[PDB]
Symmetry: none
Subunit: 103 residues, 2 copies
Amino acid sequence: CSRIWQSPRFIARKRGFTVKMHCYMNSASGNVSWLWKQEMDENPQQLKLEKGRMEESQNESLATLTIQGIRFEDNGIYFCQQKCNNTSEVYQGCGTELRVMGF
Amino acid sequence: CSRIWQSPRFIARKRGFTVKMHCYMNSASGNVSWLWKQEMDENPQQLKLEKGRMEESQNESLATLTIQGIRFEDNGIYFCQQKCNNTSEVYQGCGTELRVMGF
């Protein structure tokens, strides 16, 4: 199968704004999901797309994840994950660090 | 083969100091090579070593790239690759990022 690329590595924004996180592939057994991680030891875990604040999007090449109303409680690193058709193995993106802040 | 794990993710250090970067793998068809990216737009372009001040070492399970007396020209992201035994696939780390300081 294909390989996935995550952008950007890091993001800092102001409380209440909006964020976009990308990932690229070719839908080779496409259909992408997003994992979240707040602690460093614990390992990534399914992100709950909170009604009216988060939305998993995806066409055939781009799989973007968009969050609005950014809360501090959103801090952490997010990874897009794809399950391969052939290899039936899971490739992970390199994730994006998220930091909310200020006025 | 084995999922490659690069560490740390991002580093900040005043110029001149030396810096080590890590890459954990399995070395099966291993023998790691290091790539470089001066910006995010650019593409992971190969790394050229310079006079005793940039040395890559490694063993059974730990490849580590070392840079002495760092400069702003060093700023960027470094990745490590390892061909795979079985697969003949090309795994790659999530690269460690570098930013040199001014004081």
